[PDB]
Design a protein around this ligand. Structure first.
Ligand SMILES: Nc1ncnc2c1ncn2[C@@H]1O[C@H](COP(=O)(O)OP(=O)(O)O)[C@@H](O)[C@H]1O
Ligand SMILES: [Mg+2]
Length: 365
């Protein structure tokens, strides 16, 4: 309740996120997440064990309810925050939709603008405040086993989706350079491997690693490999916060610690592991679910449970982490961001891309 009649921050393949540059208290220490560009009969039934959710008139209530009633059950309220729907004037959105641009990338602006056809939107806490913030999009930290992975593709079990992906990514000139990062070290649950992988991240950040100083981006994009001058540049900007060219071994170590310590990565890999069958498997259920033939036996309910659980792992595989630091002794909050319910149609796309990735990496040999 209130209706609206804000400075650029970030943007994934869904929302614009802007920060609050004003003096109002309900809005201070907040950020507003805006949509770019309300359930299929099949979605309603997949998510039907929660009526409030399946009843939703628009996404804002939807994500909000999803996160609160589907996810928070799984991750606890500590690192999660459901969001606050909030009214908006269509004219508001157009106004912003120009205040944007600029910092805005291009291959991105291309695909999507702001959805001027919502009058709703999400307000969230600005985990870049309380300061040095890290955001990790870890991606998937495990390997499959599922007896539904073809024989032809026996690498899906020995080489991570992320790693196989970088290759293709490359062929398509998304990234100029293979990433060092191995989501396995990170989800490996050991202090030693955590740090390996966060150095990996610093090293070549891409769209996984990002650092924020009083809300201001000082490392990260996605990006190409950290050229040594950016090193001194970044190590420079550190001068102050950290008492120590060592401020940057120490800082990574400081991240290593909070990530491993909070053990937030574990209470995550579990949800990611809800993908019990892998898309090669789960795709068959999807078609039965929707009423068509698996162009690639269990009761309707088990199939549904399966596709459903897949989509929740799917949420957890595409989320990001935020770690904040203050005051050597430091404070820190870890929070999850980007915990969206995935469209049921993505099942065809999920499988599409998987097919393509495993097929390309299989060639490479
Ligand atoms: N709660 C938050 N606090 C501070 N910054 C955020 C928050 N949520 C998102 N951001 C920034 O905005 C970016 C885009 O937000 P995100 O929710 O990931 O959008 P998308 O779903 O389009 O990826 C994030 O990667 C992060 O850098
Ligand atoms: Mg994102």
């Amino acid at each position: 309740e209130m209706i609206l009649e804000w400075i650029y921050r970030g943007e994934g393949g869904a929302n614009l996120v802007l920060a609050y540059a004003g003096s109002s208290p309900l809005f201070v220490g907040k950020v507003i997440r805006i949509q770019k560009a309300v359930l299929t009969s099949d979605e309603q039934h997949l998510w039907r064990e929660n009526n409030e959710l399946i009843s939703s008139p628009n996404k804002e209530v939807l994500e909000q309810r999803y996160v609160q009633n589907v996810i928070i059950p799984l991750l606890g309220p500590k690192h999660v925050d459901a969001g606050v729907r909030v009214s908006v004037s269509k004219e508001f959105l157009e106004c912003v939709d120009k205040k944007v641009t600029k910092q805005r990338p291009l291959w991105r602006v291309n695909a999507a603008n702001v959805d001027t056809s919502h009058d709703s939107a999400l307000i969230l806490n600005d985990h870049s405040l309380f300061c040095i913030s890290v955001e990790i999009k870890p991606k998937c930290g495990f390997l499959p086993t599922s007896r539904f992975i073809g024989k032809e593709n026996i690498l899906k079990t020995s080489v991570s989706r992320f790693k196989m992906h970088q290759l293709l990514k490359l062929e398509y000139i998304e990234i100029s350079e293979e990433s060092e990062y191995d989501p396995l070290d990170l989800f490996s649950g050991s202090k030693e491997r955590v740090l390996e992988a966060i150095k990996a991240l610093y090293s070549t950040p891409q769209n996984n690693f990002r650092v924020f100083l009083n809300g201001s981006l000082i490392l990260g994009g996605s990006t190409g490999r950290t050229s040594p001058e950016i090193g001194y540049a970044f190590e420079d900007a550190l001068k102050g916060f950290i008492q120590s060219g060592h401020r940057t071994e120490c800082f990574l170590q400081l991240v290593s610690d909070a990530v491993y310590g909070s053990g937030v990565l574990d209470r995550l890999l579990e949800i990611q592991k809800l993908d019990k069958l892998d898309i090669e498997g789960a795709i068959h259920c999807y078609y039965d679910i929707i009423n068509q033939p698996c162009p690639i036996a269990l009761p309707l309910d088990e199939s549904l449970k399966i596709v459903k659980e897949y989509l929740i792992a799917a949420t957890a595989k595409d989320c990001s982490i935020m770690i904040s630091f203050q005051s050597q002794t430091f404070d820190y909050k870890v929070h999850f961001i980007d915990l969206s319910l995935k469209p049921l149609k993505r099942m065809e796309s999920y499988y599409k891309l998987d097919k393509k990735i495993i097929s390309f990496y299989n060639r490479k040999q």
